[PDB]
Amino acid sequence: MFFELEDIKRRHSLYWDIYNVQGWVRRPDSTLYNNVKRGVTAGVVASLVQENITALVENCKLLATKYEKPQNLRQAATFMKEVFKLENYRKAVWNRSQYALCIGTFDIGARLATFRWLNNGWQRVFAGFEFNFVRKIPTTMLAALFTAPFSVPFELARMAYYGDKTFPKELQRGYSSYLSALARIPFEEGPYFLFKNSFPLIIRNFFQTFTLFYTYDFLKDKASFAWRVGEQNEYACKMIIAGISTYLAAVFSYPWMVTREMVDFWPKVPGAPCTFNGNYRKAAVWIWYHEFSGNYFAGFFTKYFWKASPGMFLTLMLADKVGLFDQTTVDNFGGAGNNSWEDTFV
Amino acid sequence: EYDWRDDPKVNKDIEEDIRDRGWHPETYDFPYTKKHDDWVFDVTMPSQNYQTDLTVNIHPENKKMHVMKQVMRQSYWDAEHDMAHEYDYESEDLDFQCESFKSQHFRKKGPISQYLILGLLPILYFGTEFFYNHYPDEDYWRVAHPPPLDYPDTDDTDDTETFKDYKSFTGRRMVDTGIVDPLWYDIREGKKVYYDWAGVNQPMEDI
Amino acid sequence: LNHVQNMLEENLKYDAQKYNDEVAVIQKTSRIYKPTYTIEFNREGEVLVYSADPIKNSVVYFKYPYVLYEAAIPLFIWAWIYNPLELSKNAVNSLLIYPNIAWIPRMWYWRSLQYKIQKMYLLRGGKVAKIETQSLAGDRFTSWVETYQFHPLTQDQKNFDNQDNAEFLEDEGQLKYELGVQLDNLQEMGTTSQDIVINFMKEGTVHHPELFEAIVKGYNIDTSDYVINTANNLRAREGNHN
Amino acid sequence: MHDTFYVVAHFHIMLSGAAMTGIFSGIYYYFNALFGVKYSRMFGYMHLIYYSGGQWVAFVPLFYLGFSGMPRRIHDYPVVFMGWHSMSTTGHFITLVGIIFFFLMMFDSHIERRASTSTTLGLPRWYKRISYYIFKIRYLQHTKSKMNGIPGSTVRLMLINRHFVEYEVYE
Amino acid sequence: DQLDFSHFDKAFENKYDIVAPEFGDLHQKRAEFIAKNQGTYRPVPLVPNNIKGLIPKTCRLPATRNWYRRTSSFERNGFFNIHTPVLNTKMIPWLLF
Amino acid sequence: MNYSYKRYWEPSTAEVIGLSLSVNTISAALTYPIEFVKVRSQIRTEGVGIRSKNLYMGINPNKVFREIHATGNGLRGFYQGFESHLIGRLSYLFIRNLTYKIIYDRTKPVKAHNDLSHREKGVIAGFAGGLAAFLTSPADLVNTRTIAEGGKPKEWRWGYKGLMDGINKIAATEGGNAALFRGSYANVLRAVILNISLTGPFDYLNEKIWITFGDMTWNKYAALLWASFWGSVATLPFDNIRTRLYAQNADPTKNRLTYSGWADAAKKLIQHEGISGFYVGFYAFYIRTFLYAWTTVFITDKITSDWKRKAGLKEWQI
């Protein structure tokens, strides 16, 4: 042995079955390098578009608080031109592009790579539907867990960067950009400054990943009769499926981001113990057990939807385009799919 | 009989369930007779009278934060008390019903690990049956492997004969017609190697 | 998450806490109007200050923005039926998408017709006004709204109109134009809704111009000088010419 | 349609779907009477959605197969049925997921440990308008008590609107 | 003495010393500044004042200028109405189709 | 299953020593904060026990981590005493692996597809672990005293700045080299139980998963999770008693409880805390066990497979 446990590898005699083409068969393109490359590409593109969308939306809201919203289309074009002209908009584009690269190469790319690595080998039925999708429930779940905290350090680095930007001159770190802040924080405030009390982010990432990927794969297989039996475009159908999956992911991920508002933003009752004890997990449990589901969905579209949903939608579209949702379908009667060919044609 | 280790104030290691902040099931009487509900005013509707007051406008949207009232926590069983009260002294206790209503058998909740077992009951039952009983057979749930070359015998797995058939005039013409799919493996050395596009695992080694 | 220090976040927390503490439910006001005459409330202690028949005076069917869509519908149906463009199977169905969504603006307009005020009474105490409206299907809605909720809009309704100085009543005392009034919180049918715009049509009778102007301008009207008229003329569900 | 999968679809829709949905309706209707606690809404909604969807998806393709001449008790069938059969099997697994959620909610119902409150407030019938008044008063008081620790409309809107605190350039 | 659990003893104190600020010196200085200057110091994001072609927003605008109509509202006590009167009109076309 | 073993390549003594030292150095460096949290959790509930109820039973590892970080030393504050921990672990592994290799080479079966039954290998591993733990008890004692102080009053702390410094202070103050072996029998029992609680459960579930699901890749990791759970269940009471005996101060005044031996510590744990008082810090202990075992198994398997492929072994023999 090398320590208290011995991994006793054993040899086994061969086995075979009648069919070979509806269980786990790892695909030839499921190597680590290929999965990482494809996931990183899709993630960085989706994240760049999402962060440009966020910067544009928030700088339009910033300009609209000081100037009247446009009345007609010409005024809308002028308003958009002035938004683009803003000094605050260009720096936001640059820094959020750096943030998008960081979260695409390490969070969305990691999610896509892990999902493909765990779910590449689930083959589909030849002229039917993948009936045994329950086998993907643990698998996908694992991926979500394994990729839940991969965005937390980057998100907290972005938060610290902006918080530094908003303090007086004597109390500023002088962060030149987002990458400078990300590189400097672990050696100034420590690595735990990027992970402390990050349960909302972790569980939100978990629900985003699981709901998005599971719903998209399930619908793109189970709703396949929409363009196989009754001939439809399959591209409008794929877009509709991606939109449904994105909406479900955003719905199931938002309530965990309200715990921030409930814990350290709601005014406190003087002389009384603070509810939730400032934990975000007691708050998450209270939300889970709350009777009125509308109380923790206020601000869904104002605070969260238009900052994650376009990114998730483009992530699904680009992942399907590159091929991270493709599964092998082989005839279960002819060729390599069968070991009893004598009953195939009788 | 005061043990500060059991006191949530002195003993800081007793973690507080914030969903049971105002509820102490230890102090629940059976039958329950506490009054924890009454008229609540001065939250949004003031208890004062300003119906005719022209100098006062009521703005309920300025409601102030108050202490959150959690949903009532269900009673938790006391093992010793429940066993003592429901105990019967056979052959020396009369078979009768007490006049008082406190003799009622009230139901109180208990541990939750049993319900952890219950929550995974479908998973455990299906796993038990299919995997533990190995239903329908041993090889059904195993990862699928084709047999090795000509295994167990050429009568069952005639890999070499099919390899020759696909590589002959008739086989090439049949593939040309388009009604027969191409050959899915190659016999390299004495090993049958399936092509990547065949979508199957490789055969297991004959150990 | 909370260990990250943001000055804007701290300002937001301070604003929320200060609004929770200093700003109370009970607010003192000095907007009080004393009418120059004795107010004759009805048997139910409320004086009718505005009456109208908004549905009778509105164009219901042949309204310009919506007749355009409803007349474009047959063109799309014909284009699907005969396929003059030689489109594929999906494109003609995309053509058929339109007829399902072309009557929605008319639905919104017909809904907007029920936010034009049919009746407005001023209850005793001068702090509540009762507003009665009616939908196009004969449903009748009643809403009691505090006087301070009313904010007049301009004639074009594009911008808010200045309170304490605004002329929406002519010299005689009737409405000069269709007046738009915004309500910060209107409880309609038991559901509170924010920023609801109501309209008082020009072809409507403004009884008690002073009381109407004070209610619209968000005044607490002093109804100390009052009498009660014991007239049981009205009935429940009384016909009103829509 | 005798001894075909049309009959199987008919009686499976009826028995499985209707009977088990009514049984679950009774289980949730008598959850406090049966278990002494109130049920959790999240896994209950998941159970409802998945069980109903599974029933439909599993037993409509059986109608399709019954119209095409599929006998009942055959474990092997003509090749032209597999498609719908796969869909049918898919539906069953959806149903199974719903079943899982059912058990989960029961587990989730005993982590919660809340005392159930009847929605009628003790006034099941509004036979008179005085009953309506009593119910309305008690309901408003109950809702006001529930909405304690949740900020007012103005503070909530202030928090929601001013959420974004990430700007590059300040004055 | 100890092992008499009727009154607490200092030997059972599970309190750890505080050697230094948890996240460095500047974090502590910023926390002190926040404690002293929460609300008095208000940074303002930069927006140019005189921009041609844009009408400055002197006052709040009515609901007439809104491009989109909300289907959800707030009760005055904080309750969030999802099922509003607007939701019925919005659900009419989907239900019809 | 006695023909099922695969020992066609046997590493030499130099190979096993070097690989064990390097890989276990990495593994111990990764999970030392988790061990620190577990020891602190065991320390803070000596006379108290588990006082919460239902799902709140036990001590939250994250709460202890947050408190130790809020102390102000950062993550470097979780690596205090790591010198003692690493030296003790490496010495224990050296002695245990040497003795196990010797007794195995004297006793292993002739055929490469045969191996000792888990009972025989368990006896060998228990003897080796007991010997090595007895010899490295001073280092384990210094490490546990370094970790425990901080959750103790100022006058109760020992103040060790290293392993040799701690050993010198223990020998000089308490008196004699017998002072270095305080609670060494507890360490021997812990090592005996730990060396027999992991190989058994791992092979059980690994082979059963293979029988059920064939030759997938997740079988060994699921079996590793199961083996870690059962090893933590078996070993944690002994680890708790070893922590109690190690952290006990020489002065009877400076102690929440005074233990005269292993049995006395167990008796006073049952009296004040109950049976459930043994399993405090179970989540931390189980997580550390699983992470340490996973790191060691993964790296060792990669290295040994690379070595086998260079030795000409066929794929089914690797």
Ligand SMILES: CCCCCCCCCCCCCCCCCC(=O)OC[C@H](COP(=O)([O-])OCC[N+](C)(C)C)OC(=O)CCCCCCCCCCCCCCCCC
């Ligand atoms: C002493 C106590 C004994 C207790 C009983 C024995 C253990 C029971 C607990 C098992 C826990 C679950 C382990 C799952 C591990 C799966 C790993 C894997 O990839 O497996 C591949 C297998 C097989 O996937 P497959 O689709 O490739 O294989 C089908 C068969 N061939 C190869 C011919 C195509 O996946 C599953 O079995 C799905 C597992 C999903 C999780 C639920 C597990 C329980 C139910 C399993 C039966 C199937 C019905 C599922 C739906 C209904 C669920 C209620």
Ligand SMILES: CCCCCCCCCCCCCCCCCC(=O)OC[C@H](COP(=O)([O-])OCC[N+](C)(C)C)OC(=O)CCCCCCCCCCCCCCCCC
């Ligand atoms: C799950 C991880 C997902 C990662 C996804 C990708 C993330 C990419 C970005 C990473 C950003 C952070 C990189 C930090 C790299 C090191 C920098 C450095 O040297 O910092 C100085 C720090 C030391 O400085 P410091 O921490 O003292 O901080 C200095 C500042 N003061 C003192 C003011 C706070 O270096 C280290 O900490 C390195 C030592 C090894 C740390 C190992 C940690 C193991 C944690 C185990 C789990 C937690 C314990 C158990 C809890 C639960 C128990 C059950």
